[PDB]
Design a protein around this ligand. Sequence first.
Ligand SMILES: NC(=O)c1ccc[n+]([C@@H]2O[C@H](COP(=O)([O-])OP(=O)(O)OC[C@H]3O[C@@H](n4cnc5c(N)ncnc54)[C@H](O)[C@@H]3O)[C@@H](O)[C@H]2O)c1
Ligand SMILES: NC(=O)c1ccc[n+]([C@@H]2O[C@H](COP(=O)([O-])OP(=O)(O)OC[C@H]3O[C@@H](n4cnc5c(N)ncnc54)[C@H](O)[C@@H]3O)[C@@H](O)[C@H]2O)c1
Ligand SMILES: NC(=O)c1ccc[n+]([C@@H]2O[C@H](COP(=O)([O-])OP(=O)(O)OC[C@H]3O[C@@H](n4cnc5c(N)ncnc54)[C@H](O)[C@@H]3O)[C@@H](O)[C@H]2O)c1
Ligand SMILES: NC(=O)c1ccc[n+]([C@@H]2O[C@H](COP(=O)([O-])OP(=O)(O)OC[C@H]3O[C@@H](n4cnc5c(N)ncnc54)[C@H](O)[C@@H]3O)[C@@H](O)[C@H]2O)c1
Lengths: 341, 341, 341, 341
Amino acid sequence: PVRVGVVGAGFMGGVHAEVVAAHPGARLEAVHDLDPAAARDLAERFRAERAEPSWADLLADPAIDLLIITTPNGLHHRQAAEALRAGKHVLVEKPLGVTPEQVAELVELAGRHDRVLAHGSNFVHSPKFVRARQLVADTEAFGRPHLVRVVFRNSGPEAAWAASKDLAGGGALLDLGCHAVELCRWLLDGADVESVSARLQRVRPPALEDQALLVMEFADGAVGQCDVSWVTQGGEQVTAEIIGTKGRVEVDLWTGMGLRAYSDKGYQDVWDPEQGWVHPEWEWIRASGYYHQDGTVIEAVGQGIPLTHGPAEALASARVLATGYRSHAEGRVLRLSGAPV
Amino acid sequence: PVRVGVVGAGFMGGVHAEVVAAHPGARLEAVHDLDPAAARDLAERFRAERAEPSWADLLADPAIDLLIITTPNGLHHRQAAEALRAGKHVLVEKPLGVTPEQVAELVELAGRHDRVLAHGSNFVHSPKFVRARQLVADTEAFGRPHLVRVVFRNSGPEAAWAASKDLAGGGALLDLGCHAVELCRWLLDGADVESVSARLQRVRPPALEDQALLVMEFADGAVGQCDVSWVTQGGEQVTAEIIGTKGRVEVDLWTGMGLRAYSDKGYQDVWDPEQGWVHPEWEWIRASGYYHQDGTVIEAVGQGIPLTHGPAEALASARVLATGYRSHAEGRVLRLSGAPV
Amino acid sequence: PVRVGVVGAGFMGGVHAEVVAAHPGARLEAVHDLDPAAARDLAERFRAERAEPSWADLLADPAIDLLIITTPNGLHHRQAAEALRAGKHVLVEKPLGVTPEQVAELVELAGRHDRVLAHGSNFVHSPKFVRARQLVADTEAFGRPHLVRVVFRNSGPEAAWAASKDLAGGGALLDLGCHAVELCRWLLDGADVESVSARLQRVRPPALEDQALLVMEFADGAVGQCDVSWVTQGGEQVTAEIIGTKGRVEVDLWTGMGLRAYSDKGYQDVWDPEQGWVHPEWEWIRASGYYHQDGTVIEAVGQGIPLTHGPAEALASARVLATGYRSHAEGRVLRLSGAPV
Amino acid sequence: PVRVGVVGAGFMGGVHAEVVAAHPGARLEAVHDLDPAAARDLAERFRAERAEPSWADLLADPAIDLLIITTPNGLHHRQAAEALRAGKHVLVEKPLGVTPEQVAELVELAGRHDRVLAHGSNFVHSPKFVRARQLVADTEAFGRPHLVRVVFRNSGPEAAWAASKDLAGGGALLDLGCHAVELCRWLLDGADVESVSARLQRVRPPALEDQALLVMEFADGAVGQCDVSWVTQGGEQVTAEIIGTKGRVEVDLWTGMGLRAYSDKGYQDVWDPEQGWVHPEWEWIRASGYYHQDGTVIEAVGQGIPLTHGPAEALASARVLATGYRSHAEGRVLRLSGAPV
Ligand SMILES: NC(=O)c1ccc[n+]([C@@H]2O[C@H](COP(=O)([O-])OP(=O)(O)OC[C@H]3O[C@@H](n4cnc5c(N)ncnc54)[C@H](O)[C@@H]3O)[C@@H](O)[C@H]2O)c1
Ligand SMILES: NC(=O)c1ccc[n+]([C@@H]2O[C@H](COP(=O)([O-])OP(=O)(O)OC[C@H]3O[C@@H](n4cnc5c(N)ncnc54)[C@H](O)[C@@H]3O)[C@@H](O)[C@H]2O)c1
Ligand SMILES: NC(=O)c1ccc[n+]([C@@H]2O[C@H](COP(=O)([O-])OP(=O)(O)OC[C@H]3O[C@@H](n4cnc5c(N)ncnc54)[C@H](O)[C@@H]3O)[C@@H](O)[C@H]2O)c1
Ligand SMILES: NC(=O)c1ccc[n+]([C@@H]2O[C@H](COP(=O)([O-])OP(=O)(O)OC[C@H]3O[C@@H](n4cnc5c(N)ncnc54)[C@H](O)[C@@H]3O)[C@@H](O)[C@H]2O)c1
């Protein structure tokens, strides 16, 4: 039985807490957060063994097998490192690291300590995305993939820390792009990136990029687009399309639920938009990959099953983003080495 | 651990076998089928303890706690009765009975033997339908429901037995209407039916009805429509709409998955239509309510938790259908007693 | 050049005025309305020769070739009769008459005076509905039609007169049903109605029906449904579906425009809902059949071309509704003669 | 009455012939084509005054006021020049020119001869796109536009000439991009482009690009994407999305018609895909902008009304594409001058 501690009790701490609570092969042992009231809140919502106000004490506890790190991005590196060094397995919310060396160093460290290190690329475990990838891999029907596009848009992060280079490590390209990139590669069966191009925008007044377009050229000839935004109203969008020589497939997470509803007021449990026509959500957490992701990690820690999607894939997406940032600066298409095509 | 035997190893035996095999609180003990090779095959797909070629022996086994009956409708009454008399809990695939007296007799019987009797109204446990119901019950946003419509259409049953009055008990009105009716009433919080009206059609040449419309007048003033068909091409449809004084809720099961795909050929894993634009499916079993339904039954047997949706609800739908059949024959709107409004 | 006068300057007077103004083969000569300020308004918006405050004077004018009657339903009979007797051709907004004898009498009268009498069954001239009918008539692809359903729903008429039996002649069944029925028959190439069944509802507090379901059985075996409502929020709905032995076709007028838009505020020229996700409209008038309808009438008056869709079709739909009203009262399925099937 | 000659009697000659034949303010005088049987055939479909086998004779005819040039792109420059020099007004199908100097030279020329020169940017006159633009220009609802994306994809041109650099002038970027670019700029009220970035692909084996992405940075801060493909199956796509600080607008031409249909066979009048679920089309020519475009040109020639959208706009799009081609070659983001940002 896999004994889990959740580091950081904000939005994603809550998502992971729910999943763990529900997983028969695991137990929610601890909730930690710099703000101890937020940790208590959550230990209670999900019947965690305790709320741990102390980081040192959390790491020292020999009962905890696995930590899930859902703190701001700037902190991932330091805490994942500390947690591995304390002998705990770690799942870190994306971005696993704010730079490729940070990621490389964590992967290296996990090995030293013979630990499972996983990252929060949930959409790659989303049952509907998994299905989508099967269909593109159906060569008779689909042919050779030549285009993949992933769109991730919302009205921006609300936590202050996401506004700071020091705390967030990056703007919308890192927050959302990391996922879009990870998905583009995964959808094409781990395609090798040969070049990267990107432009960034600051749409909102004063600074981190709110909107970005990143484009990858892959070995097989295909091209991948990542279009992400902090600055799009009317509801979170997560979509993808893959186009081949013979087929197409299209995936829609938040408006592909099969539910529409209308009211003047707003419906009790329907985030946003509240009013008029909305697309209520059902099993959002499952649909998004979290149950499956966490289950994989739990099965990995519990019975040394290898991860289907490992932190090497985080290193690749980090290199892509780093190269994307540099491409924007220089106004050029670059190879992963930083060199101008 | 709830020890389960699956009676009838066709299509739905397989669906239920899967769900049981995955449920940590249950074990798939036996698979029975008049055709023993079909039972062997399924015991193997899903690692059942054994294939039981004998019905008497199955009933006599004190190891089996619960039977799931997935045989043709004509056989439900007799086998559920026999199984209850042998002291086994029973989940019967809908229609629970081919007439209201058949249903009544089974409910009575289960009480006599202090047994859990459940029926296969899966859509009522479908997470997206559950969500839909919450929204209609949100009186501030939705207001008073005045119209509910459920549509169930396909290109007709593939098994020969579905062509026979003795084996099927009925045509499309019983095969599909049962579900549509059950949903209408459940979506309106168990609304009482005061009248019923129906017309049936025989679209295909020679006989059981292959298309039907049934309309219910409810106590609170609302009207429910059930539109079902065996004779609709281009893919199974299951949709629902609820309309209130203030709101609307629309639900779409088979084309509310958020996946579209196109090929000339057809995609290896995609039932039908095969070619051109299709709407592939993800977790169809979960989406349809089966994991949740069966979980409720397993929790009901395992720790005497009352069923959220019991066989009383099957008696009501049976009365509605019986009344529907009679209404068509007489050309009139009827009360549940058979009397002409 | 066809010289036109528009009787009644409310909503539909405005629609017809626009169409006429734009038609190269016609001229907008006069606008009449009991309220002369409303007539002046409209003569001005669309550059009509004059506003005519007097009905007697309007009828007497030898310049006017054609009147378009867009007054409340109770008045159609009397004014169409007066206008025909004055030698003017007439297009009457639906319902052409509030009863079948009223319709029969007008058709008879038009003949006496050798006049073109047309009615406002615009959707039957809607280019997208026309296309839909071609596809159903494509026997190789579609097969034999066995089901047709037309849905017409909105949040109800806003003019007071629509609340009065004397002024409106009927509730939602007559206001909306007339169209739905007309469309069902037309979509199936003028199918003969063998029976009719209907239930009506009063959803809003005190009285005319706000919501109705009417069902037709046709000669060829097909069944038609008309589902109409004054009591549906979130935006006017006009949809249709036809299902055959081999095909299906689905038609969507107001959310089949290919435009979505989102705002908090509301967008200047986007009726309703105003706020959140909306489906703006483009060329609504054309899309709805009015340009084509009126053009047919103009071509009929201008160069004695026969009408593609005549006022005989209004007599049939009147008989259907009359029989629908009676069916509801008696609780039975009826033949067009009033006789109980 | 504006007397028109249609140069080139292929697909688009036919589209334009139809529109002209229907326009009360114009007459279809002549059809010319190097292939005189193709010209005869079209003169007949649409009741043209004559088929003109000779180009010199066509230009010399003082009866012809306006030529519509629907020949392959390579020929536009030479024939528009010759036609202007002969004193004829000209509408040239896009691309107006195969390079900016070609376009510039034509604009210059038309001024010299006091002639109306228009180009075939039809989507810019598409009523549904016009509507879309109003909505984005609704600053209260929409805010400041920061992203515009136009997608144009199909399975590639069917005429042989489109395979040749000399005859086509270019691949998919010029054939489709021209329209996508033109739309991006028009949707943002004629926005000034400050930089351009592009990658091209050759998906099909041996050469002209069959897929492209082009990205524009505009003066006001906004970013435009043009995604075009010759190598996308399952049906022509033409879509657009505009995103602002407060709103979004989405437009869909070919699957925003509100018609769906299904058959096994294929429906007699439904291009492609033929089989399974399709999206039949209604008034495709109107919906695409051609009636309105040609009407503007006819009103411009007939009564010297300035064009709402002139050939200056074609020079801008040409500069963008030229810059796009160069950007791909150099691997860099460029200014319109060719200089590296
Ligand atoms: N998978 C996804 O789709 C997704 C979605 C949103 C966010 N995220 C990622 O998840 C992580 C957390 O995001 P979130 O939106 O829940 O943020 P949040 O602001 O809602 O939660 C963060 C919490 O951590 C706390 N915290 C701050 N410093 C800390 C410290 N030193 N030790 C412990 N706790 C500390 C804060 O008080 C806050 O309660 C981020 O890395 C982000 O990139 C992922
Ligand atoms: N709720 C739903 O979603 C849903 C969907 C489909 C079917 N069903 C229901 O499930 C039931 C079975 O449907 P199916 O599609 O699986 O039929 P099927 O043809 O696939 O399977 C029937 C099986 O039962 C076996 N069988 C027949 N008579 C038997 C007997 N007397 N004893 C033991 N085994 C016997 C057959 O050999 C066959 O293997 C039906 O009652 C149907 O109404 C429900
Ligand atoms: N085709 C459609 O889809 C559609 C839609 C709405 C209404 N209609 C029909 O069109 C007709 C008019 O509907 P509307 O919504 O414009 O109503 P409206 O109330 O907007 O307009 C009616 C106008 O006629 C005037 N009027 C009243 N008595 C009159 C008289 N004796 N002489 C002249 N004018 C008089 C009123 O002052 C008002 O200005 C109705 O018959 C209705 O059934 C059709
Ligand atoms: N705006 C749009 O929506 C759109 C759509 C499709 C095509 N187009 C454009 O329209 C133009 C024609 O396209 P199409 O698809 O009709 O090509 P097509 O193959 O259908 O027609 C070309 C015709 O021109 C004739 N022709 C060739 N050379 C000629 C010459 N030198 N003089 C006279 N006639 C000649 C050919 O015999 C043929 O009949 C192209 O420039 C293309 O870019 C525009």
